[PDB]
Amino acid sequence: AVPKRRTSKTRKNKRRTHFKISVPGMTECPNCGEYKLSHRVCKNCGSYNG
Amino acid sequence: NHKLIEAVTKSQLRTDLPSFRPGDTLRVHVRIIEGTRERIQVFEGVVIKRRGGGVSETFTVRKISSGVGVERTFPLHTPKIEKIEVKRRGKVRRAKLYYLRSLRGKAARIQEI
Amino acid sequence: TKGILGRKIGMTQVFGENGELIPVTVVEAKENVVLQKKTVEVDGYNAIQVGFEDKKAYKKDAKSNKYANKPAEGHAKKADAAPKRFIREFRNVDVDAYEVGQEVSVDTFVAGDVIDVTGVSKGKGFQGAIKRHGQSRGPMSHGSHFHRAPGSVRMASDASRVFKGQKIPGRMGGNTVTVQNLEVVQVDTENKVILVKGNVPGPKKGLVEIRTSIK
Amino acid sequence: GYRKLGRTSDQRKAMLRDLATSLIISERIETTEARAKEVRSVVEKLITLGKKGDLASRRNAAKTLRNVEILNEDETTQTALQKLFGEIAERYTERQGGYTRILKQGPRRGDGAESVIIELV
Amino acid sequence: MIQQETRLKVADNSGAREVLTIKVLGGSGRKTANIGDVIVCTVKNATPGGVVKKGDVVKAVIVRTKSGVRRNDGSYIKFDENACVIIRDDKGPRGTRIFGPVARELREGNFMKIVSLAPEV
RNA sequence: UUGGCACCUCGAUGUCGGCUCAUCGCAUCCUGGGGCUGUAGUCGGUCCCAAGGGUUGGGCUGUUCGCCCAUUAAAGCGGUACGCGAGCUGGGUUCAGAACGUCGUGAGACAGUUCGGUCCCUAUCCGUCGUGGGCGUAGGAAAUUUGAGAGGAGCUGUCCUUAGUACGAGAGGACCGGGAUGGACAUACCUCUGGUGUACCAGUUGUCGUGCCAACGGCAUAGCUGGGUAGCUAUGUGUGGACGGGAUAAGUGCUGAAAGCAUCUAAGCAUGAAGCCCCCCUCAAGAUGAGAUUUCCCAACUUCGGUUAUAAGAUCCCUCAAAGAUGAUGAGGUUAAUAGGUUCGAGGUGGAAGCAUGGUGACAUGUGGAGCUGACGAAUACUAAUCGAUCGAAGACUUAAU
């Protein structure tokens, strides 16, 4: 099938309400002092506790 | 092997039957009550399979009668088998003797110990 | 006018008095207590609440459903009992014969009782119309191009629309099902186990509701 | 099976044999998260075989290992079945299970695949 | 008997040798018959000398099946071929002999005459 | 239905039969309830009410139509663009080839017949089936629920007693009641019987490799063959359409005048169908008319007349399955048995390697019901669920009474 009518900019932007990405999900490393992903090793000094 | 199932069906198991393997001649005394009196019929044949289980174990026996093959399958713990004798022990190489269905006459004879 | 809660364990078989074979289901029903009594003067209808399986106590940093939370402890403190994770009501019983905080035993059911069983069916996922609704295939040869598409729900052209309640693919299973007119085979006092002749809806370790037959 | 890893039956078994062998040689490798959770069972059941030491245990482990040669030490060469039965199994005689540890790294460029580190405890 | 085109052997003393199922009696839409059922059939092979000839549409009853039957005590019996016996209208065999073992479920006050002649029940 | 007319469509509204058995009407084929009979009974004929459910498989023909065979309680008639080709086919009919009969001087046509002959499209909007997020329901939360409504199911045969009784010269042969067992359909489930079971066990052929023997590995459809765990399954195993109320349809009445008689009707009172409303099963408070019950949390700063984070609680992120396209749902996160590993089992296969004895040898016997084993039952913190972060209340106004 082919579209019957042109899609307006109002309808197009409504459809993109939920099209987006999320936050990485990061925590602070208490050896590096810098940010890292949860349950992943630090990348500054390469340490993983626990 | 659940704890509850094996604890309820414990009173159905019968510690009165002999030990047999697939491929031996065996006689089963069956209590038939077909009619107006209770008599005993005897079925004699060769054991061809025993698929395992607990109280739901089964076995199958095969015999030849007037040119027609017959299969009988009983539950091992049913209260309708009086007793069981082991006439002779055979020599087989597997657990399921399904190849006996296509063999008739001389080729269908199993060796002995 | 009696009911319990339990967990389905599996299927087995037992022998009858005449030597016949019947299939049975092993059901484990323990730790049943009475938690509340709703009356017409207060709630507008008579019923009793029953809890089935006891949880763990309160915890400061609990993360799962293993430990009871604060609101559930107050409800299980009115009647002296540990918090329960399965709570169901029974409208078929007479309230004045029951008292809040007493155990419900499998002895309430005797052998030969006629019961109905309620449970939740097993889930199958997203299924096609052949399996979900039990309709037929199209030809598999003779130049055919119609094998497993929906083939019994066609529509006309006058209405210019599709009617409601059509039978096309979707999610199947997971529904509330009742099986009526089952029979109690044997009750077990040491293991709190009941044997029900037949089969009941649901998977292993699923909750089942047992009542008396209404008809 | 357990998880098909996007391979046929013959390819899956050949790839688990290569990953398991290379882990004995270097004792620390980097791979994919999904692959690492299936290598666990393969390597750990090979260490159980090397802790028995019987001839039948040796011949049952030669059906999974590959014929590599390890000239890593400055002394005489040895294969990967001599190292499994000689050195690695020597230091695991006390602990029962859990000879493998997995550490997460993160997504990799161009694919987004989660990278992990797998090593012997 | 299982279908509308199943060919049956005949195990009595008459000219008929093989038959072909034409219909399964006992209800609208029924399409399977088992031991103890009556069917409408036709004769495809016969012997020279007998009351039954080729091309005759007759009634028969079922005595042996490869699919067998289940008792209400958990036992099964399964034969090695499919066989039938031609009968008169009043449940009576039109032959004088019966060959082969016969299923034990044919005695319920309905087919006593056939059971009497059977060499083995 | 065959026709009449020529109002939309020729910058295109795809034409017969079949697959499908969806949806509707009643002028009812079966079942349910009745009046009359040239209704003795068992069957019938004709008319009235009734649309709840049901209303087979084959041979011939491209066929619709029709004839026939074997059954059935019955094998109903019609509409839906002669229902349905962006769902399927392409047998027939109106493309290009070739042949027969007939017509024509001819190129060629059929009042006709025969063999062969490309079926395109990734779904924007409405509609239909499943499944999530936001806000609202005048504090914030966890559970349990009422049912305004809506949707399912609704079929029927054969035997045995009453009774060889009533009826009938006789042959024949019951209404009204009480039981047993089926056919078709629906739903749940894997204990039994089978199917499958590409990381389970065993046998065997060719050819490469592990330096050789022995023992194993790759390729040849999973090389082929015999079995088979969990899970998914029917042809397998259980269950249901039961018993009952209320008002009615056609009919049958009681008591009664208009109309001193008569009359079911004008007032008044009864009875009466598989049909209507309940009674059985499922969904259901976005039912904005947003319902009910039991529990839990509730303080500092202003004068901001209002904020604040925190409390109860729930997630981010990790180990998973009884759930699953994703997401949701459910079992867990060290104060821990959620998954992997280790140790015991169940079930499956069928007698491992090495060694000894016997044979010239292919092989056989013992150590030993051996060895091996995916999903199933237990125990065990040896590995991984670390440390952490985010959201989430302080309860508006009017009236009445205590």
Side-chain angles (χ1 to χ4, degrees):
Chain A
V2 303
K4 191 101 185 160
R5 300 278 326 152
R6 178 172 98 186
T7 286
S8 73
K9 38 184 78 175
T10 293
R11 197 176 288 252
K12 165 183 74 185
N13 278 302
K14 273 172 177 203
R15 198 184 58 234
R16 294 181 178 154
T17 287
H18 296 106
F19 185 66
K20 55 195 176 182
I21 78 185
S22 182
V23 290
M26 61 205 208
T27 65
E28 308 85 337
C29 189
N31 173 341
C32 305
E34 75 163 15
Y35 278 92
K36 74 176 202 72
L37 288 161
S38 304
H39 291 91
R40 276 98 184 158
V41 309
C42 196
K43 290 186 286 176
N44 190 359
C45 66
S47 75
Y48 188 58
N49 74 321
Chain B
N1 203 7
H2 204 267
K3 304 322 171 93
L4 290 157
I5 297 172
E6 300 217 310
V8 175
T9 72
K10 179 51 69 181
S11 287
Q12 304 281 327
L13 294 174
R14 316 167 46 188
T15 64
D16 198 72
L17 301 198
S19 48
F20 60 97
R21 283 184 188 188
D24 43 4
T25 307
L26 189 139
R27 301 168 71 92
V28 178
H29 301 255
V30 186
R31 305 211 221 200
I32 62 170
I33 301 91
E34 288 204 58
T36 50
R37 67 182 188 89
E38 181 212 12
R39 72 161 194 118
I40 294 289
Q41 183 174 320
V42 182
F43 195 102
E44 46 203 12
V46 55
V47 169
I48 59 162
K49 82 185 278 198
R50 295 176 81 189
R51 49 165 317 281
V55 74
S56 52
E57 212 184 330
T58 56
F59 70 101
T60 299
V61 289
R62 168 177 187 92
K63 84 176 308 290
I64 297 169
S65 45
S66 79
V68 182
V70 189
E71 291 315 310
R72 271 301 272 186
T73 298
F74 319 103
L76 188 87
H77 299 301
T78 182
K80 291 177 71 68
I81 286 176
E82 190 152 355
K83 64 163 160 284
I84 277 163
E85 294 84 3
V86 177
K87 284 172 101 203
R88 54 208 317 271
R89 319 257 175 169
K91 196 162 102 142
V92 291
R93 285 308 279 284
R94 56 207 66 250
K96 303 279 199 297
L97 316 171
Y98 295 140
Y99 66 93
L100 281 198
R101 300 198 187 115
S102 194
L103 261 50
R104 180 73 180 91
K106 281 267 188 67
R109 294 171 221 251
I110 302 179
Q111 315 280 89
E112 211 183 339
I113 56 148
Chain C
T1 78
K2 50 180 83 77
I4 48 154
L5 307 167
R7 260 197 210 272
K8 156 177 174 176
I9 304 287
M11 297 200 56
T12 186
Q13 63 194 43
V14 300
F15 294 113
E17 185 55 35
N18 288 317
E20 62 192 28
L21 178 69
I22 62 170
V24 300
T25 300
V26 184
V27 174
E28 171 186 78
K30 58 161 170 49
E31 301 155 9
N32 272 286
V33 305
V34 180
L35 288 174
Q36 212 190 307
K37 283 185 49 174
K38 299 188 179 184
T39 44
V40 58
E41 46 257 41
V42 173
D43 295 86
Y45 74 102
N46 305 297
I48 54 168
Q49 269 193 357
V50 165
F52 168 44
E53 187 154 335
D54 43 18
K55 279 218 252 187
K56 292 181 156 208
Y58 182 70
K59 191 186 175 189
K60 195 51 178 84
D61 277 294
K63 300 181 198 197
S64 77
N65 211 37
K66 196 200 280 180
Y67 312 92
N69 55 346
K70 200 137 195 194
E73 272 176 301
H75 179 70
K77 195 182 311 152
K78 298 297 293 296
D80 307 335
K84 310 284 186 182
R85 82 158 66 232
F86 287 118
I87 296 160
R88 251 61 172 185
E89 292 182 354
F90 286 87
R91 278 182 75 171
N92 53 334
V93 310
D94 46 308
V95 286
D96 63 358
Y98 276 98
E99 184 176 0
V100 179
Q102 65 182 357
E103 300 288 327
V104 188
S105 47
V106 296
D107 306 337
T108 61
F109 290 90
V110 295
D113 274 357
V114 168
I115 62 186
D116 54 42
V117 172
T118 301
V120 166
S121 164
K122 315 169 82 191
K124 305 303 194 328
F126 182 76
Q127 287 301 327
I130 306 294
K131 186 195 273 295
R132 195 188 177 194
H133 290 118
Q135 65 183 358
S136 303
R137 299 161 317 165
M140 291 305 288
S141 63
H142 292 284
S144 174
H145 290 117
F146 196 97
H147 303 323
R148 292 193 78 91
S152 283
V153 294
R154 211 69 62 194
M155 297 269 149
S157 284
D158 202 296
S160 292
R161 62 191 197 81
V162 187
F163 296 152
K164 278 176 96 78
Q166 184 178 2
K167 290 185 189 324
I168 50 174
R171 185 165 293 185
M172 89 174 284
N175 306 117
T176 307
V177 191
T178 285
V179 190
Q180 298 183 322
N181 292 350
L182 288 194
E183 183 194 325
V184 177
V185 171
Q186 183 194 2
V187 308
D188 191 2
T189 176
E190 290 273 66
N191 296 115
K192 327 274 188 173
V193 168
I194 309 188
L195 291 182
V196 185
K197 179 180 177 291
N199 54 77
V200 304
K204 305 282 205 305
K205 304 188 276 204
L207 181 77
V208 290
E209 290 151 43
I210 300 185
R211 289 180 176 92
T212 313
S213 190
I214 59 169
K215 66 182 181 180
Chain D
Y2 290 120
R3 74 173 80 201
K4 313 198 253 210
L5 295 181
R7 299 255 198 268
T8 45
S9 198
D10 52 2
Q11 291 176 239
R12 184 157 60 248
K13 196 222 290 204
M15 182 165 108
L16 293 165
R17 280 177 77 181
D18 263 6
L19 280 163
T21 307
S22 84
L23 173 54
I24 296 170
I25 306 161
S26 82
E27 311 206 60
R28 174 171 171 111
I29 63 169
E30 182 180 2
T31 182
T32 303
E33 191 211 35
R35 304 192 186 142
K37 291 182 180 180
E38 306 304 309
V39 180
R40 285 192 307 187
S41 304
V42 178
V43 290
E44 293 208 358
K45 297 210 202 92
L46 281 175
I47 294 169
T48 301
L49 276 161
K51 286 171 79 181
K52 305 203 211 298
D54 288 329
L55 191 82
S57 280
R58 198 185 292 266
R59 296 189 165 181
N60 292 348
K63 303 193 278 196
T64 304
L65 279 187
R66 310 273 216 196
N67 301 308
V68 302
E69 154 167 46
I70 304 149
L71 185 60
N72 202 312
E73 53 268 17
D74 286 333
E75 60 203 30
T76 315
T77 80
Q78 55 164 14
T79 72
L81 193 76
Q82 313 209 49
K83 187 170 179 189
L84 171 61
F85 266 69
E87 179 193 299
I88 288 190
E90 201 206 350
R91 67 184 184 272
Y92 286 120
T93 69
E94 291 315 345
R95 65 170 70 227
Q96 304 141 19
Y99 322 104
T100 300
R101 168 189 290 131
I102 294 188
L103 296 159
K104 289 200 197 51
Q105 280 184 162
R108 71 182 173 184
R109 188 194 173 271
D111 198 74
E114 176 67 26
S115 289
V116 295
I117 301 299
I118 183 157
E119 81 201 348
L120 301 169
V121 174
Chain E
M1 83 287 278
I2 284 284
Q3 291 295 115
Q4 296 293 321
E5 311 286 310
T6 310
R7 291 216 189 171
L8 299 177
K9 282 215 172 268
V10 192
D12 63 354
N13 199 351
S14 293
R17 264 181 70 141
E18 310 166 42
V19 296
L20 171 70
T21 313
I22 282 180
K23 185 66 93 165
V24 169
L25 302 164
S28 162
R30 175 178 197 178
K31 54 183 41 183
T32 300
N34 199 47
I35 284 171
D37 283 328
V38 178
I39 59 178
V40 187
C41 53
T42 187
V43 176
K44 290 288 187 183
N45 188 358
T47 73
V51 298
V52 176
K53 290 276 169 265
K54 258 181 58 182
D56 285 332
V57 173
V58 299
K59 305 278 200 57
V61 72
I62 297 169
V63 299
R64 298 210 280 287
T65 47
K66 277 182 70 67
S67 73
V69 67
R70 178 183 202 268
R71 324 270 201 190
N72 53 46
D73 63 74
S75 45
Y76 311 83
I77 178 159
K78 288 178 190 181
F79 292 99
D80 186 74
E81 77 176 356
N82 290 287
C84 73
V85 164
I86 303 187
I87 54 179
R88 269 161 313 127
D89 58 351
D90 58 355
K91 291 168 200 232
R94 68 177 43 224
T96 67
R97 290 172 85 187
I98 287 171
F99 307 120
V102 173
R104 284 61 151 161
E105 308 92 14
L106 278 162
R107 45 175 49 169
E108 270 206 347
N110 47 7
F111 290 116
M112 281 315 327
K113 189 40 183 41
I114 297 89
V115 180
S116 296
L117 302 164
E120 180 145 55
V121 174

